[PDB]
Design a protein around this ligand. Structure first.
Ligand SMILES: CC[C@H](CO)Nc1nc(NCc2ccc(-c3ccccn3)c(F)c2)c2ncn(C(C)C)c2n1
Lengths: 826, 248, 326
């Protein structure tokens, strides 16, 4: 068996949702911000946000909504986790003591159901009579909000429309009514139903179904003054109430897909809309009241306000202040002005909240010779793309290096005092026949620049037609200085060439240090790339020189230096190249038993291969024979996102299901089969998407022995900005820390009453297994924060065991030391 | 695709054993003893008639590819039965097969099994499988005797007499080389033909085509009487050579 | 000739890797040196010498040389390790069963979450599967073990069955004792959960139906660890075994022993109301408690769902090979 420890170094930073209400007091205006597994509660001041409380939940927050049922003084909070844990929460404050109450809880998972494409949707009735949930295709789940439903029991109504895009509870209906956009073979339609708690079935809807834009995306419930709904698409916005139908199709929105909406004025006159290119719009409901006293929606208007960070969620707070919740870039507080500035913008940024964004890749480098270590991340996307320099301070100190284009890979080249970064930017087919970039960015603002002139694929004769307005990716290699982070150079790759891998190393007997990039030729027609290049560059005297190029019949997904040779993955094939005295790559040997060789890692003469679906494989170079051999494969099937080698026997992997596992050699020679069978000895549900595993530590400022029981440092980066660390334990320490977890879980009160053991259970749509071989360090590190009565309760009847005896009981003041030492690895 | 498992009578003088110096009479004597060994052993255990036959068809085919002077017959027989049991889903442990052999064999005969009987047998399985070209499925005259008998209508007692006498002839055919010369369907018809001539019954009347004097041609196409007469001659020879007489 | 099996050496194949763990040996992927054909080699070890050649392999050889269908995996030949050629007794070498190479296994594709099956895709898949089961059921051979791991699909959209290790012939007029525990619990019919030893060919149908639901949910239907818990899950959906629907349930050994929590009512149509009508009728009939009332393969092919599917269309299932990378 294997024993490992996993802790969070940086909590998730990306904003996954945000709501406003009166949650802490019936009087205060609250802003609740949801980050993966984290809930942040703020109070809205005139200057900005006053933080008041932050809690963690044993689950990914999928639904977050505030509501106030008749009889309550203040808003209650509903949260549904991605594993279908549902709860109703309350804020209670006794002077200085702040705690969160679990009012109702349960798991709403069905034994049979097909998870929907558009994801979990949760909505609440305007009269707070019920919670609607859209978990599975063909079904609508109702939790009625009666006082006695403390377990959140619920029933399913059969839904004929299998493919639902979005649904909201509409305002101003005689009975609870839902308005949804659905897709069947004839296009998309907007249809309405009425919900009966007494009958437990749908009834005919208030207004006629209409057939809407093919890419109709979002449904807006309009307040009672106007009633009805607004449907947001790619080209048009429409309003559907009864016999009333409006449609505005302003050309400005066609340019970028609108992803978020929020209501500014409670009457419904004004709404906020945001799009993927970061633009912020105002949607205006121009009202014409009729003489009888009725209020009719005369027309809709769209007005461009300015630019924000590409926003996942918007929420208007008060006065001219709006909170921009961003998943791909920094979140913001921006003020909307009545008067435009001299550039024509009504939006002016107030505060910027750091978001490490998606961490596509990262490396650890000792920039200052501190003996420590700094983490340089590829963070963000599109106009939010950036590098982040992260060093341990008690807080982390983070420098931001804006790129305005998407970073893809990073590697450090000490000889050149610079980084090499792979990036891609979006240009659009323009009237010239070429393309035009939406904005300048790192690859266009380099001091010196170059473009590949390779003739390898120039024979073409393969037609790829272009339509005006279509997007394309343009890929570059950026040379960036390690002190200033000036873009010294930018190398643009071939048209339709994607840069997928980057290394910096010396090869063979060649003393030069090179940047080597692995490319794949991507054409929309191809399901799998069939052409690719390995390019050897040299950065010398402020210029990047193309040294050698090797054509390959596939995608060079990953490349790694291997004892002076170049090891690369080309689709299925895994290949080792030698670097000749003629400065050309020469193939030595190949391995072909892979579906798709997405990730590579090495140690000595051993290689670990991460396949798309066939998990991890341990390869070996047999030096005497000059070929690859197969040591052992994980026959259990997993979709892999990143892999790392822990030691010569233990191997770490990350699943696309937000899970982590550890495979070990069986190391028993009773049969060749046991040797060739990698055993999954560790299973752990992380809750984050790991893109990169990297050996190192930022706390190496002490660089000293006698500071940790645990050994090894594997840092990892995730899509939600979370940075974590994995380290190994001895059997004795794990059994101690494990036994302590079980004790802590009985003592610590969970938000939503979610069992910790359930949360960390390995979970895919098809399997659920109890966690094994992993210590949730974030649970262990919470021992220090629990009250003294609880601490002594944890250590009761606890006997520590170790090799060489020492079967003794330990006190709580002993453990406060042990955990404090463990809080030092990060 | 699938191998040819049938030879011509003339080809049986060029069995490996014959060329190593075994005379035609002796190879046939060896053939009977080995087959009867397989039969008696399996009967002493609890085995389906198909399992016994499968071992015997294996044994017979084997010594068309190897010589008796280098492969002791009772070891081969035991090995065939052991494999036949696994093929026909009537499995037996090799040790149980060996024990039954010791009960039925002379001490001299059990000498063929050498110092370690189970080993000599289990080791042969490799050769047996390669020899039979891994064609394990075998059809036997029994199924055709019943399939064809079922399509006959008449006095139940007269029909049953034909079936039992014929079933006796099939069991005797396993001792002969016929399993190597003629397909099982032809044998089932041949043993029916013989029972018909001996019981003075006229089978055509029971067939659906009573005027079709060549009654068998509605079961087995393209079989001349020549063949049925040769087979009958070969079956009755065993009785005339031995002290045993036709069952009747 | 092509028919002289067991002599050709495994030298003739370049071994690419090990695709899977086997029952009697490891399964290797290889390329034929002479033709370039990709094959799948399953290793058979008679070195154990406990019982010599494993019966599991004997069944797979005996049956697959007799059975030829587009949905039945083809055993191409049997090859051997290098021969000592001096004494056969010394030889401890092993045999290899050559099979065609199928690109993926259904469990793998579902577990990698890389497949989206449209109604039309499920039609092509279930049609091939049940046509193959019909061929075998018409030849009176029983798979006795149906699982997602055992159904292999080529990228071309062809389907093949590949678990004849636990196969035996069934005689309709003459019933005999059979091995009780034959299917992976997830795809085991209620009869075998209650211990019926004289089982009909319909044990395989129950399994194929479990798959039909799985293709529509992408999650196995009856996931349990213990035989009683499995009967409970089946009962929660199909209804509790009782003489009202299964008149011979009292004849089955464990009926008085193994009771579910309640006498549940059948809800199969309610919990699967998101499935197309033609498919739901196929599922409801295939997941019938009484094996004598459970539909056969020929009847499944003469269904509104699978009857009018053109086998030529062979719509490939959807695999997102490039989008997955990022
Ligand atoms: C059915 C037993 C299991 C199912 O799983 N193995 C099996 N998988 C076959 N084909 C499916 C298959 C399974 C695994 C991989 C794989 C694994 C690791 C790395 C690279 N590839 C694979 F690329 C293809 C296949 N094709 C013919 N056979 C014969 C032996 C019947 C087969 N056997």
């Amino acid at each position: 068996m294997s024993y490992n420890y996993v802790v969070t170094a940086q909590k998730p930073t990306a904003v996954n949702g945000c709501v406003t209400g009166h949650f802490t007091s019936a009087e205060d205006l609250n802003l609740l911000i949801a980050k993966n597994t984290r809930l942040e509660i703020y109070v809205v001041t005139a200057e900005g946000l006053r933080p008041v409380k932050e809690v963690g939940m044993y689950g990914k927050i999928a639904v977050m909504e505030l509501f106030r049922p008749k009889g309550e003084s203040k808003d209650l909070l509903f949260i549904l986790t991605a594993k279908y844990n549902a709860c109703i929460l309350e804020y209670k404050q006794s002077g200085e003591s702040i705690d969160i109450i679990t009012r109702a809880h349960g798991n709403v998972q069905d034994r049979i159901g097909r998870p929907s494409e558009t994801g979990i949707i949760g909505i609440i009735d305007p009269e707070c009579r019920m919670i609607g949930l859209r978990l599975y295709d063909g079904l609508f789940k109702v939790i009625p909000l009666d006082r006695d439903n403390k377990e959140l029991k619920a029933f399913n109504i059969r839904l004929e429309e299998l493919h639902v895009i979005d649904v909201k509870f509409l305002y101003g209906c005689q009975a609870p009514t839902i308005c949804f956009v659905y897709q069947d073979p004839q296009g998309r339609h907007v249809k309405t139903y009425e919900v009966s708690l007494r009958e437990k079935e749908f009834n005919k809807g208030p207004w006629k179904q209409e057939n809407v834009e093919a890419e109709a995306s979002m449904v807006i419930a309009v307040p009672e003054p106007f009633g009805g709904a607004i449907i947001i698409g790619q080209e048009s916005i429409t309003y559907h109430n009864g016999d009333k139908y409006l449609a505005i199709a302003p050309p400005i929105i066609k340019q970028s897909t609108i992803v978020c909406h929020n209501r500014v004025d409670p009457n419904g006159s004004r709404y906020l809309l945001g799009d993927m290119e970061g633009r912020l719009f105002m949607l205006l409901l121009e009202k014409e009241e009729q003489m009888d006293g009725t209020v009719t929606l005369k027309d809709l208007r769209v007005e461009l306000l300015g630019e924000t960070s590409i926003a996942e969620c918007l929420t208007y707070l008060d006065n001219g202040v709006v909170f921009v919740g961003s998943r791909l870039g920094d979140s913001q507080l921006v003020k909307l002005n009545v008067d435009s500035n001299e550039q024509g913008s009504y939006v002016v940024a107030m505060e910027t909240f750091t978001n490490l964004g998606p961490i596509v890749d990262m490396c650890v480098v000792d920039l200052e010779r501190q003996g420590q270590g700094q983490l340089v991340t590829c963070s963000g996307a599109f106009k939010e793309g950036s590098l982040r320099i992260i060093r341990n301070g008690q807080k982390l100190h983070i420098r931001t290096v804006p790129l305005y284009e998407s970073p893809r890979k990073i590697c450090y080249q000490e000889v050149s005092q610079c980084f090499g970064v792979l990036s891609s930017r979006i240009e659009v087919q323009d009237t010239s026949g070429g393309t035009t970039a939406l904005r300048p960015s790192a690859s266009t603002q380099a001091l010196s620049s170059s473009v590949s002139s390779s003739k390898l694929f120039s024979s073409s004769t393969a037609p790829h037609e272009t339509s005006f307005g279509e997007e394309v990716e343009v890929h570059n290699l950026l040379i960036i200085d390690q002190h200033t982070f000036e873009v010294l150079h930018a190398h643009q790759f071939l048209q339709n060439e994607y840069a997928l891998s980057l290394v910096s190393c010396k090869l063979g007997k060649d003393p030069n240090t090179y940047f080597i990039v692995g490319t794949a030729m991507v054409y929309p027609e191809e399901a799998e790339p069939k052409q690719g290049r390995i390019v050897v560059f040299q950065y010398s005297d402020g210029k990047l020189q193309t040294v050698a190029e090797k054509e390959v019949k596939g995608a060079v997904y990953s490349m790694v230096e291997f004892n002076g040779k170049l090891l690369a993955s080309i689709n299925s094939t895994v290949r080792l190249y030698e670097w000749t005295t003629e400065k050309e790559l020469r193939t030595e040997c190949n391995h072909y038993n892979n579906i798709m060789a997405l990730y590579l890692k090495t140690k000595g003469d051993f290689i670990l291969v991460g396949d798309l679906m066939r998990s991890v494989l341990l390869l070996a170079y047999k030096p005497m024979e000059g070929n690859f051999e197969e040591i052992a494969r994980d026959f259990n099937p997993n979709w892999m996102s990143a892999v790392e080698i822990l030691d010569d026997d233990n191997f770490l992997g990350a699943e696309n299901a937000f899970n982590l596992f550890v495979c070990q050699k069986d190391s028993a020679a009773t049969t060749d089969e046991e040797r060739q069978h990698l055993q999954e000895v560790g299973l752990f549900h992380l809750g984050e998407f790991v893109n990169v595993f990297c050996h190192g530590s930022l706390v190496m400022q002490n660089l000293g022995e006698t500071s940790t029981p645990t050994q090894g440092s594997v840092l990892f980066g995730t899509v939600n900005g979370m940075i974590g660390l994995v380290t190994s334990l001895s059997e004795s320490w794990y059994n101690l820390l494990l036994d302590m977890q079980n004790r802590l879980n009985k003592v610590i009160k969970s938000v939503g009453k979610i069992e910790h053991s359930f949360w960390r259970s390995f979970h895919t749509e098809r399997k659920t297994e109890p966690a094994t071989g992993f210590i949730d360090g974030d649970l262990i590190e919470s021992f220090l924060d629990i009250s003294r009565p609880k601490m002594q309760e944890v250590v009761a009847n606890l006997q520590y065991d170790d090799g060489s005896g020492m079967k003794r009981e330990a006190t709580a003041d002993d453990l406060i030391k042990v955990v404090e030492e463990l809080t030092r690895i990060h | 695709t699938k191998p040819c498992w049938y030879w011509d009578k003339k080809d049986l003088a060029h069995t490996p054993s014959q060329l190593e110096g075994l005379d035609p009479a002796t190879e046939a004597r060896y053939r009977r003893e080995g087959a009867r060994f397989i039969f008696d052993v399996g009967t002493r255990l609890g085995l389906h008639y198909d399992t016994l036959a499968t071992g015997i068809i294996y044994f017979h085919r084997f010594y068309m590819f190897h010589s008796f002077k280098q492969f002791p017959r009772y070891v081969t027989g035991a090995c065939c039965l052991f494999l036949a049991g696994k093929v026909e889903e009537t499995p037996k442990k090799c040790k149980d097969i060996i024990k039954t052999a010791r009960s039925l064999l002379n001490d001299v005969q059990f000498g063929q099994f050498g110092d370690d009987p189970k080993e000599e047998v289990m080791v042969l399985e490799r050769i047996l499988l390669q020899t039979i070209k891994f064609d394990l499925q075998v059809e036997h005259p029994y199924q055709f005797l019943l399939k064809y008998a079922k399509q006959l209508k008449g006095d139940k007692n007269k029909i049953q007499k034909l079936v039992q006498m014929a079933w006796t002839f099939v069991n005797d055919s396993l001792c002969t080389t016929l399993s190597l010369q003629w397909e099982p369907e032809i044998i089932a018809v041949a043993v029916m033909y013989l029972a018909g001539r001996l019981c003075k019954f006229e089978i055509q009347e029971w067939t659906s085509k009573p005027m079709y004097r060549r009654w068998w041609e509605q079961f087995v196409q393209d079989v001349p009487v020549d063949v049925l007469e040769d087979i009958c001659h070969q079956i009755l020879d065993l009785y005339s050579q031995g002290k045993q007489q036709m069952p009747h | 000739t092509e028919s002289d099996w067991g002599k050709r050496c495994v030298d003739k194949f370049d071994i690419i890797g090990i695709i899977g763990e086997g029952t009697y040996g490891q399964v290797y992927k290889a390329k034929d040196k002479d033709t370039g054909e990709l094959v799948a080699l399953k290793k058979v070890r008679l070195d154990n010498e406990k019982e010599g050649f494993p019966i599991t392999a004997i069944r797979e050889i005996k049956i697959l040389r007799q059975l030829i269908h587009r949905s039945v995996v083809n055993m191409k030949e049997i090859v051997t390790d290098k021969q000592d050629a001096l004494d056969f007794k010394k030889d401890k070498g092993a045999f290899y069963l050559v099979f065609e190479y199928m690109d993926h296994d259904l469990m793998g594709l579902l577990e990698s979450g890389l497949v989206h099956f449209s109604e039309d895709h499920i039609k092509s898949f279930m049609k091939q599967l049940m046509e193959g089961l019909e061929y075998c059921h018409k030849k009176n051979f029983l798979h006795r073990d149906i699982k997602c791991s055992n159904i292999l699909l080529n990228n071309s959209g062809q389907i093949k069955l590949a678990d004849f290790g636990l196969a035996r012939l069934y005689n309709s007029e003459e019933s005999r004792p059979y091995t009780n525990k034959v299917i992976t619990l997830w795809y085991r019919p209620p009869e075998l959960l209650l211990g019926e030893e004289r089982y009909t060919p319909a044990i395989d149908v129950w399994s194929c139906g479990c798959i039909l639901g799985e293709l529509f949910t992408k999650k196995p239907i009856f996931q349990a660890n213990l035989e009683l818990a499995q009967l409970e899950l089946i009962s929660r959906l199909c209804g509790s075994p009782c003489p009202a629907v299964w008149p011979d349930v009292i004849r089955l050994p464990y009926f008085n022993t193994m009771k579910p929590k309640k006498q549940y009512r059948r809800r199969l149509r309610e919990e699967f109301s998101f499935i197309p009508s033609a498919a739901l009728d196929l599922l409801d009939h295939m997941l019938t408690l009484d094996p004598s009332k459970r539909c056969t393969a020929e009847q499944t092919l003469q269904s509104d769902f699978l009857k009018d599917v053109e086998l030529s269309k062979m719509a490939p299932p959807d695999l997102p090979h490039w989008q997955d990378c990022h």
